[PDB]
Amino acid sequence: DFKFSNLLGTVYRQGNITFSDDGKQLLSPVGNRVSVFDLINNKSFTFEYEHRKNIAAIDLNKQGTLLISIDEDGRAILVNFKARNVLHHFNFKEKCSAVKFSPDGRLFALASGRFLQIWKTPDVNKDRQFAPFVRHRVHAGHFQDITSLTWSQDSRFILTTSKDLSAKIWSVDSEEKNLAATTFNGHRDYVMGAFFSHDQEKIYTVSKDGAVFVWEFTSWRITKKHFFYANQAKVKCVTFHPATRLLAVGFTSGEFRLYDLPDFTLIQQLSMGQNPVNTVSVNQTGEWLAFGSSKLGQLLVYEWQSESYILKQQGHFDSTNSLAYSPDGSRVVTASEDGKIKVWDITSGFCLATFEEHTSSVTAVQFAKRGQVMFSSSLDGTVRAWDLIRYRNFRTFTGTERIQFNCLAVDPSGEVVCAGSLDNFDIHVWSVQTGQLLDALSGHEGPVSCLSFSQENSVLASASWDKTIRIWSIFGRSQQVEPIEVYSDVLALSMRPDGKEVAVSTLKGQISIFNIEDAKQVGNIDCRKDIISKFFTTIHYSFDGMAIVAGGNNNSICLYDVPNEVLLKRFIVSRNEVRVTSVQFSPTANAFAAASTEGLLIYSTN
């Protein structure tokens, strides 16, 4: 069946980002889920699983098989990275700032408050554990919160940094030395990073005030001191890549910097925005610098030798009204209250374009199928045709007066486009080509609020405040000149593709189906499932007319069997008001897309 697969409009929220071990993919906490970006192919996806709250910390083990993520309350989900299934939950009972697997993947380490926890794979001797990792030791030493962790390449040692202005180094395999083996004093401000150098004979400590200390064995003594002298900015994050000797630093201003150690040579000095750099990652070759800022919330992948950006996105924050799939199913396009229209590439997850001609809320968008032509309707009140190959607005249809448009229907062929208004009881009709006004469809006696064509030429259903469905043919003879009486009110109407039936969603929790030849109700579904009086405001038939997908101002999205009038699957939108305003199958119904308050949601099957 269908599973959550993409979260569009959001690339980074909070927490740490991390490259895969080969340096080719980037993981990004995207709220309470984790996204993965394929940087060499421009694909991304989002994991199905959700945390109870926002993610605070993640790590992918070296062997590329185990993903662990931790929400703000210290509730951790461990995931089979390659099969995408959840393997386990941990409760660490405390806020964790950082988690990191040991290089050999046998261990992982936690920063929970002031403590360093070490977790291990169960010994076959103790022989009766049902968890992939048991806790092996808690290490108590710091006076305040551990800030970051760094493993020693041999996996036997770890560095912690803290707000207590020290770093410490722990022996974390040999049983049992529970106490830090060396403490590193003392910076003025919080120690942000502490790193072994590639040869393991130098340690670097970096601190919020802006200091780097070099430490060598002689006991460990400070050997040199360096300073960023960045003004009105503190170190907000830092990482180090030992083999290429690269230190990447992100500041509370938009600024980030690249150095090498131990020379402390300034290689790069740039900005990413005007907001804090919350997380930084250097990929395996050193060639690629990743940055996350929360406020906006940006994600950057930067190839610094060539001064070019591999990836550069921020979060989107529109209120979406309508969404429409392109016929190939490659893209979905969304309509926004501010009046913007956006084009999204399903496979990359990114926004290809942004039109802004509409000077008022875009109420609907719909594809002429084929080709790359998309129509939009607006309160402003115009209908606009859009070319998606050249990304422009060639035609613009209006009425002989300034009337808002609320709904939109594009004859699939598409000879003609039509739109309903609140400012009258007629359906307005334009020849696409001419592209002038045609004789309206006038018989409704309430404002028309829903429109829907079939695929099989060329039945037009409409729905009105008058609480009736009418059936039209723009040019030929209708298939039902008689009205249909719904008791009511109709929030959404989807015409079955064949054109022999129609479905509507009512103000009661009813999806009801009507035969058009008989103008009588053939099926009613009582929609009762809404993890929230209760209804649906958007429905859509699948291509073969066997399924309806539905959402409304609640937290459930429902997938109904239409013949058997049952529920196939319910999708709880969010696990922490939630609204879904537009819902639609992809052309081959291999997926469906939902415009929610939690962003653009894609559910898929494979």
Author numbering: 4 to 221, 247 to 560, 577 to 620, 678 to 707
Please quote the paper that reports this structure.
In these yeast cells, around 50 AFs and several snoRNAs, such as U3, U14 and snR30, associate co-transcriptionally with the 35S pre-RNA to form the first pre-ribosomal particle known as 90S or the SSU-processome. The UTP-B complex consists of Utp6p, Utp12p/Dip2p, Utp13p, Utp18p, Utp21p, and Pwp2p/Utp1p5. Pwp2p is a protein subunit of UTP-B and essential for the stable assembly of a large set of proteins forming the SSU-processome. We report the structure of the N-terminal domain of Pwp2p, which exhibits a prototypical tandem WD40 repeat (tWD).
The WD-repeat-containing region of Pwp2p (residues 1–716) was subcloned, produced and purified as described in the Methods section. The purified protein was crystallized, and X-ray diffraction data were collected up to 2.54 Å resolution. Pwp2p (1–716) contains two canonical WD40 domains, WD1 and WD2. Each WD domain is a seven-bladed β-propeller composed of four anti-parallel β-strands. The first WD-repeat domain (WD1) is composed of residues 12–343. The second WD-repeat domain (WD2) is composed of residues 4–11 and 344–706. The connection between the two WD domains is ensured by residues 12–14 and 342–346 in addition to the external β-strands of blade 1 of each WD domain, and the loop connecting blade 1 and blade 2. The two WD domains form an angle of approximately 30°. Several patches of conserved residues were identified, some of which were spanning an extended area over WD1 and WD2.
